Amino acid sequence: ALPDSLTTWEIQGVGISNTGICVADTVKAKVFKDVFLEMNIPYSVVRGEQIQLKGTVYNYRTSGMQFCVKMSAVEGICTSESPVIDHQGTKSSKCVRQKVEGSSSHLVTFTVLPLEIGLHNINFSLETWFGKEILVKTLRVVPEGVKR
Amino acid sequence: FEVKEYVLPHFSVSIEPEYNFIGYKNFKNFEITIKARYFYNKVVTEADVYITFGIREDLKDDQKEMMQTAMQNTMLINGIAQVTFDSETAVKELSYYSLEDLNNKYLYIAVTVIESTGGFSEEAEIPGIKYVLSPYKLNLVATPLFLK
Amino acid sequence: IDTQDIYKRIVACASYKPSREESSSGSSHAVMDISLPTGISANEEDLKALVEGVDQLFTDYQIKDGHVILQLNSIPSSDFLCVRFRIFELFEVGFLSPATFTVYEYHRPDKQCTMFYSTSNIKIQKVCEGAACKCVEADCGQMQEELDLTISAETRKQTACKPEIAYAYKVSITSITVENVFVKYKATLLDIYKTGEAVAEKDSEITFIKKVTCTNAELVKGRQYLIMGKEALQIKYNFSFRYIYPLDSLTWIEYWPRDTTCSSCQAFLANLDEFAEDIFLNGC
Ligand SMILES: *[C@@H]1O[C@H](CO)[C@@H](O)[C@H](O)[C@H]1NC(C)=O
Numbered sequence: 001a002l003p004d005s006l007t008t009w010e011i012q013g014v015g016i017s018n019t020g021i022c023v024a025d026t027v028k029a030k031v032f033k034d035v036f037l038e039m040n041i042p043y044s045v046v047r048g049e050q051i052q053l054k055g056t057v058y059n060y061r062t063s064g065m066q067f068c069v070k071m072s073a074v075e076g077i078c079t080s081e082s083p084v085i086d087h088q089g090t091k092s093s094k095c096v097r098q099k100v101e102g103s104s105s106h107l108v109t110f111t112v113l114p115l116e117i118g119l120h121n122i123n124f125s126l127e128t129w130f131g132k133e134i135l136v137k138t139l140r141v142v143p144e145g146v147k148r
Numbered sequence: 149f150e151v152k153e154y155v156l157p158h159f160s161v162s163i164e165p166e167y168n169f170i171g172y173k174n175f176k177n178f179e180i181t182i183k184a185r186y187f188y189n190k191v192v193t194e195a196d197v198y199i200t201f202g203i204r205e206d207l208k209d210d211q212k213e214m215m216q217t218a219m220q221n222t223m224l225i226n227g228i229a230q231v232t233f234d235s236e237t238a239v240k241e242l243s244y245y246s247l248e249d250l251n252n253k254y255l256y257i258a259v260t261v262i263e264s265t266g267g268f269s270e271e272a273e274i275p276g277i278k279y280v281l282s283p284y285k286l287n288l289v290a291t292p293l294f295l296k
Numbered sequence: 297i298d299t300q301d302i303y304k305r306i307v308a309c310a311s312y313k314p315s316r317e318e319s320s321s322g323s324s325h326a327v328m329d330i331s332l333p334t335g336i337s338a339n340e341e342d343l344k345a346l347v348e349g350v351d352q353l354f355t356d357y358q359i360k361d362g363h364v365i366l367q368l369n370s371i372p373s374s375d376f377l378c379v380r381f382r383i384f385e386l387f388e389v390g391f392l393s394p395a396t397f398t399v400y401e402y403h404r405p406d407k408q409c410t411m412f413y414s415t416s417n418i419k420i421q422k423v424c425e426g427a428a429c430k431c432v433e434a435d436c437g438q439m440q441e442e443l444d445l446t447i448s449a450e451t452r453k454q455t456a457c458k459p460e461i462a463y464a465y466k467v468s469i470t471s472i473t474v475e476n477v478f479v480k481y482k483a484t485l486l487d488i489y490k491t492g493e494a495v496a497e498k499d500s501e502i503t504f505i506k507k508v509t510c511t512n513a514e515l516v517k518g519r520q521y522l523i524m525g526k527e528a529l530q531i532k533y534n535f536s537f538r539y540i541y542p543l544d545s546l547t548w549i550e551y552w553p554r555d556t557t558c559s560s561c562q563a564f565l566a567n568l569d570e571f572a573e574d575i576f577l578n579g580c
C-alpha cells in the first residue's frame with residue numbers, strides 16, 4: 001500500500017546474477033489528491049517563543065468550494081483562541097468557511113507557543129465540500145541556549 | 149551521505165540561464181529563466197519571485213558584497229517566469245569598478261520564491277557565473293596523437 | 297528590545313553589567329548584532345545618522361549575512377544605551393526564523409548574550425518557569441466604574457450568556473501578592489450563577505491572576521466584585537489544584553455594594569439582583 005504524501009515517489013531497483021549487475025530504470029509513482037492540505041512544519045521550533053505556523057489548502061477541483069480547518073494540539077502548546085468543544089481532546093478553531101476559487105489555493109495561519117520539550121504531535125483537521133480529511137503532523141522543540 | 153536538517157522542501161525551483169557563462173554580447177543584456185514546479189508534477193499557478201544578485205572572487209569564498217540595486221520582484225505565472233539583468237548598470241560604483249576587463253570573476257545569483265495564494269517558501273541559488281575575456285577552451289577527444 | 301508601530305522603529309536600550317569587584321564606569325569595546333527576520337531589511341540612510349553625528353557613539357556599521365553589524369566603543373554602566381532604526385520589509389515567508397538580538401565584547405567572542413524577538417504583535421504572553429504557565433492571554437481588560445447608576449441591568453445578561461464567557465459569579469477579594477508578574481488576587485466565593493463546567497461548589501476561596509500592565513482592572517482589598525470571565529486554565533506546577541482562574545481581557549468586573557444602601561441609592565443593588573435571578577431562573 002502506497003504511503004500518503006503529495007510528492008512523487010521514485011522507486012528504483014538493482015539486480016545481481018552470474019551474468020552481472022543490472023540497474024532498472026527509475027519508476028516514478030505519482031501520488032496526487034484533488035483537495036488536500038499541507039503545512040510548513042518548521043524544524044526544531046525553539047521553545048518559549050510563538051510561531052506563525054503557515055499552511056495552504058489546495059483545490060484542483062474545477063468548481064469553487066468553502067473550506068474549514070481546525071487545529072488540535074496535545075498537552076501542551078499555548079493557543080490564542082480556545083475553547084475545546086465538544087470533546088476535551090478536540091480543539092474547536094471556530095473556523096469560518098472561506099471561499100476557494102477553482103484551480104486556486106488559500107492561506108491558513110496558526111499562532112502557537114510550545115511550553116515543553118518536543119517532539120509533540122499536532123493535528124490539523126480539514127472540513128470541506130468535496131469530502132473532508134485530517135493529517136497528523138509532529139512538532140519538535142529545542143531549549144534556548146547551547147554550550148557543549 | 150549528508151547529515152543535516154532538511155525540512156523536506158515542498159516544491160522544486162529550477163534556475164535556467166539562457167547562456168551558461170556571460171560573454172561580450174551578454175554583458176549589456178542577460179536573460180535568465182526561473183521555473184518552479186510542485187513535487188506532484190503540477191506547475192505552480194501563481195507565486196511571488198524575488199531575485200538577488202552578487203559578485204564573488206572564488207568558489208571557496210562563501211561571503212561577498214552585493215547590490216544594492218535590486219531585488220527585482222516578478223510573479224511566477226503558470227509555473228514559469230523570466231527576467232533580464234544587465235551588468236553595465238549592476239557593478240558600476242556599487243562594485244567600485246565598472247568594465248568587463250576590470251572584473252574577471254564569478255557572479256552569484258539568489259532566488260527566493262514565495263506562494264501568493266498560500267504560505268510556502270523555497271530558495272535556490274547559482275554557485276557562480278564567471279565573466280571571461282577569453283571564451284571557452286580547447287581539448288581533444290578520441291584522437292590518439294600518432295602518425296601513420 | 298521592543299518593536300512598536302509608532303515603516304517600523306526598532307529600539308535596543310542595552311547596558312553593561314557591573315562586577316562586585318569592578319567599580320562602575322563603562323564597558324570594553326563590543327560588537328552589537330541585530331538579526332533581521334528573513335525578508336526584512338533596514339534603511340541605511342536612517343542608519344547613516346549614527347556615523348555622520350558630531351558626537352560619535354559608533355565607529356562603523358555594516359550588513360553581513362542578513363544581519364546588522366555596528367561596533368560600540370563603550371557600553372554605559374549607568375543607563376541603557378538606545379539604538380533606533382526604521383525597517384523596510386517585503387512580504388514572504390514560509391516560516392519566519394526566530395530573530396536574535398546579541399551583543400559581545402570583540403576581545404572575547406566566547407560568551408555572547410542572545411535574546412529572541414518578533415516584529416509581529418504578541419498574542420500569547422507571560423509564561424512562568426516556576427508555575428509552568430499556562431497563559432494568560434496578552435490582551436488587556438477593564439473594570440466597570442464604581443457605583444455606575446443603572447445603565448444597564450439588561451446588558452449584563454447579554455455579556456454572561458456569551459459562549460466565550462464561562463464563569464460568571466460573585467466573589468470577595470481577600471489577599472493580594474504583588475507581581476512578578478502575577479497579582480494572585482486571593483478571593484472568596486459568595487454566590488454562583490454559571491459556574492458552567494467543569495468547576496463547582498462554593499466558598500472555595502479561589503484566585504485569579506492578571507498582569508500588572510493593566511492598571512484599570514485594579515481591585516480593592518476587602519471589596520466584593522462581581523466577576524464574569526473566560527474558562528479557568530487547568531493545573532499548575534502542582535499536579536493538584538487544578539482549576540486556577542485566568543482573569544483575561546473583556547472580563548466583566550463590577551463593584552457589588554455591601555455598605556448602605558441607601559448610598560444614593562439602594563435601587564442600584566436591585567438592578568444587580570434582577571440579572572442574578574434572571575440568569576439563575578432561565579439562563580443561557
Ligand atoms: C490525531 O488523530 C489521531 C487518530 O488516531 C489520534 O490518535 C490523536 O489523538 C490525534 N492527535 C491530537 C493531538 O488530537
Ligand SMILES: *[C@@H]1O[C@H](CO)[C@@H](O)[C@H](O)[C@H]1NC(C)=O
Nearest residue numbers: 503532533534535536537538
Ligand atoms: C500546592 O501549592 C501550595 C501553594 O499554593 C503549596 O503550599 C502546597 O504544597 C501545594 N498543595 C498540595 C496539596 O501539594
